[PDB]
Amino acid sequence: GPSVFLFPPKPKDTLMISRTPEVTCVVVDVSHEDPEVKFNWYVDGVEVHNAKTKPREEQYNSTYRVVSVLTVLHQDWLNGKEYKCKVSNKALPAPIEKTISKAKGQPREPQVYTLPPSREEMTKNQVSLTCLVKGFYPSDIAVEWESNGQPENNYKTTPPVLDSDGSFFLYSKLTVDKSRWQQGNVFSCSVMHEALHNHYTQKSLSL
């Protein structure tokens, strides 16, 4: 029978009023014999009607995939409203229901600390600039790096890790040529999170 997957908005999309956050309800394994698919959408159990549903699209394995997109209000998501997708198809004994929302719990402000390269790493051609982000809740977060107002791209960021006090932490690693670090250039780690003022902070690192 068909399967339903419900996807949350991206962390950045709920934190910036200029962006447009969406919840996305995807149904796969829709058969040819019962290809009609109905979507109902509920917000805290109250039905809403503004979703945009796409025409079904046959896949190379001869099943259909159908997508419904519900735009959410930033403050609704951050207030913890629950979004329910109900998917009806004639091949199903009963409609499939999925629900998604922000992780429950009291938001906690991320603490952002930058850590310079270790002495021992300075023997190499490239060095590691570290951004520790700890004590935050929920785990939805975005982390970026820049220098002189331009985005540094050569970075990797670990997944959030559940810490022992129930908050989350992560590290981001930016790799730069040691000359750039030794020339005294200024590097900034940027963090977006609902519990930060203006949903954003940056912390600077340099020699």
Ligand X SMILES: *[C@@H]1O[C@H](CO[C@@H]2O[C@@H](C)[C@@H](O)[C@@H](O)[C@@H]2O)[C@@H](O[C@@H]2O[C@H](CO)[C@@H](O[C@@H]3O[C@H](CO[C@H]4O[C@H](CO)[C@@H](O)[C@H](O)[C@@H]4O[C@@H]4O[C@H](CO)[C@@H](O[C@@H]5O[C@H](CO)[C@H](O)[C@H](O)[C@H]5O)[C@H](O)[C@H]4NC(C)=O)[C@@H](O)[C@H](O[C@H]4O[C@H](CO)[C@@H](O)[C@H](O)[C@@H]4O[C@@H]4O[C@H](CO)[C@@H](O)[C@H](O)[C@H]4NC(C)=O)[C@@H]3O)[C@H](O)[C@H]2NC(C)=O)[C@H](O)[C@H]1NC(C)=O
Q: What residue ranges bind ligand X (CB under 6 A)?
A: 3, 5, 7-10, 13, 21-24, 26, 28-29, 59-61, 63, 65
| Residue 118 touches which member of its own copies, ligand X, none, C-beta under 5-8 Å by kind | its own copies
Q: For the chain, where are the E strands, in sequence order? A: 3-7, 22-30, 38-43, 46-48, 52-53, 57-58, 64-71, 83-88, 96-100, 111-115, 126-136, 142-147, 150-152, 155-157, 161-162, 168-177, 187-192, 200-205
Closest to its own copies by CB, 42 vs 171, is 171
| Residue 121 touches which member of ligand X, its own copies, none, C-beta under 5-8 Å by kind | its own copies
CA distance 53 to 98: 16
In the complex, least distance from residue 167 CB atom to ligand X, rounded to whole angstroms:
20
Token pair for residue 75? Answer: 């403050």
Q: Which stretch binds its own copies (CB under 8 A): 21-29, 47-55, 66-74, 168-176?
A: 168-176
- Residue from 81, 98, 134, 178 in contact with its own copies (CB under 8 A): 134
